[PDB]
Symmetry: C3
Subunit: 165 residues, 3 copies
């Protein structure tokens, strides 16, 4: 009912975190981020993840994903996940460790494998993305056939992700 905010987390005074949200050590939350586990709960945000301005994390009352701890979540965000300007993560949703979600991109009703890079103005809905895939800018990924055909992340893509954060 109250968020658990790790003492080593850095949450902006003007960020809004409500309900059963667990924020791990080293997570950075910018001003004008909204995390509300008032419908769908609980939410996990793993160590050293980064949420930038305009990011929103919400969830449906019904629908859960399996966390790495074998517990059920509305939203599971792994370690070192980057959720950039204006991104929307809407439960049920799973982002594995080292994922990047680019500006104005949406993840809804989906599981995103570790080390994936989702670029700008993209939608990922109703699918499982395998680990280490690249979603190009402007992509509209709404079927498992599209998700299974995504190309692999290259070193240059991770380098890009690190520069943006």
């Amino acid at each position: 009912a109250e968020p658990y905010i790790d003492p080593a987390a850095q949450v902006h005074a003007i960020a809004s975190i409500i309900g059963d949200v667990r924020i791990a050590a080293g997570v950075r939350v910018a001003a004008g981020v909204s995390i509300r586990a008032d419908e769908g709960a609980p939410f996990q945000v793993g160590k050293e993840s980064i949420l930038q301005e305009g990011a929103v994390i919400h969830g449906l009352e019904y629908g859960r994903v399996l966390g790495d701890d074998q517990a059920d979540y509305s939203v599971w965000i792994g370690q070192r996940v980057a959720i950039t300007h204006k991104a929307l993560i809407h439960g049920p949703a799973y982002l594995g460790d080292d994922c990047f979600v680019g500006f104005r991109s949406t993840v809804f009703n989906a599981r995103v494998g570790a080390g994936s890079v989702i670029m700008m103005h993209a939608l990922v809905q109703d699918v499982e993305i395998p680990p280490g895939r690249y979603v190009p800018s402007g992509a509209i990924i709404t079927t498992q056939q599209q998700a299974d055909r995504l190309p692999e992340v290259r070193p240059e893509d991770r380098e890009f992700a690190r520069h943006i954060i």
Copy 2:
């Protein structure tokens, strides 16, 4: 100049409603919704409509649509209309009863027929959508030729809309 808020409406303390806005019985407005009839006015929001976080309703000084009461509006939102996360309704705009507007979708200078379902990351501009049409995720509908060719809403699409709200 002052909004009319029906006593049976449920408006969040942190929602911002300004100018000649009429909010009917049973309308739910989330925190971080902005409705400003400070340029284009008036706005009607019909019974049991739902506005989710990030939604914005604004309007141009000039340009109106015919409401169901035969009066002129910058924005007419019918009954049981769902305006979901980050949607932008910009007058002149008409949404008929039982319309759904999905995450990050925009309706501008357009009339949307009753019982239409507009999915995620879509734009509807400068057109009339006939009653009961479906606008797929990522669609960019900017001509009357595109609007006239949209497919019909299926029962599964309305079921989807009800689950999201």
Copy 3:
């Protein structure tokens, strides 16, 4: 470290401007605009530019553009630039005089020539757009080959831009 706000600028009480931002005479900034030169700085916003609700101006710590004064900026916005609802300008970025950026459009790591019209739901990234080009609604411009092939702005496009502001 403190913004310079020209006494002839009109900034909403609820707009958030932070760090080394220079706002020129006649600039209008709406409520719920965010301009933060807390990572990338400095930002210039030229005379009689307009920023509408939901607009965000931010910048990367590293990466600059050449301003018209031959000084380096994270973000250079020229004179009479229109940055409309939910647009994201992310440094390093240059917008020349008389540019229009339509609803929910993004300019990142790019130079946009004077008198260009970028329409709704568009992305402009990693490119130089020549002066006086048109970017259609929904366009995803991520390569210099795409930017070099854009059509010219017509009089009707500027007329459209003036009507929106």
